[PDB]
């Protein structure tokens, strides 16, 4: 329960950073490698951006603790505050031996965002982002949450981009065991 919310919150935070990096929402100069993970990770060093992402997700954490969260969407906007890109994380077993659970979610997402880096055109300059939280059917000081408008939700003709990983193309891997 608690542990799942914690794993997901950590993952989601790093994920926000890697989206901002790969998509150049902010200048590459604010990003640095984190050797705290045994998977490659770029994260912002910009203290106020980091505080912002952290506050956001630590508001989301209590809802994850009780499975009230249907999805978390990281939305990339031009500064017309139109959604131009939507990273949807739907919220719906393995050993720690090579990768921690957090690192496994990171590896999977890194495989996806790397394809992303190749299929998607560059975004216009001056893009920003926000996070949308999608609760299921049925905190912090001066960090309130409002109801989203339907301007930063819907798109003129959204295109689902299947981010099919490298391996998926190259290799299919199957395990057969005895009796």
């Amino acid at each position: 329960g608690q542990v799942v919310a914690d794993v997901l919150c950590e993952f989601l935070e790093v994920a926000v950073h890697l989206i901002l990096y790969v998509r150049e929402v902010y200048p590459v100069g604010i990003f640095q490698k984190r050797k705290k993970y045994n998977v490659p990770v770029q994260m912002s060093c910009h203290p106020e951006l980091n505080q912002y992402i952290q506050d956001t997700l630590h508001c989301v954490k209590p809802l994850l603790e009780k499975n009230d969260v249907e999805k978390v969407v990281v939305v990339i906007l031009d500064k017309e505050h139109r959604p131009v890109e939507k990273f949807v994380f739907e919220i719906t077993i393995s050993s720690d031996s090579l990768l921690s659970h957090v690192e496994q979610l990171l590896a999977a997402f890194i495989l996806k965002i790397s394809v992303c880096d190749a299929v998607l055109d560059h975004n216009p300059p001056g893009c920003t982002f926000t996070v949308l939280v999608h609760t299921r059917e049925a905190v912090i000081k001066d960090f309130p949450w409002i109801l989203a408008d339907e301007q930063d939700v819907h798109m003129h003709d959204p295109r689902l981009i299947p981010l099919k990983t490298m391996t998926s193309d190259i290799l299919k891997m199957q395990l057969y065991v005895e009796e």
Binding site: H46, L49, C59, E70, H134, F143, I146, D152, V153
Partner: peptide, 13 residues
């Protein structure tokens, strides 16, 4: 169900 977002926008840089 919302959706909900932070009132305060992401910082600038």
């Amino acid at each position: 169900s919302g959706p909900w977002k932070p009132a305060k926008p992401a910082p600038s840089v």
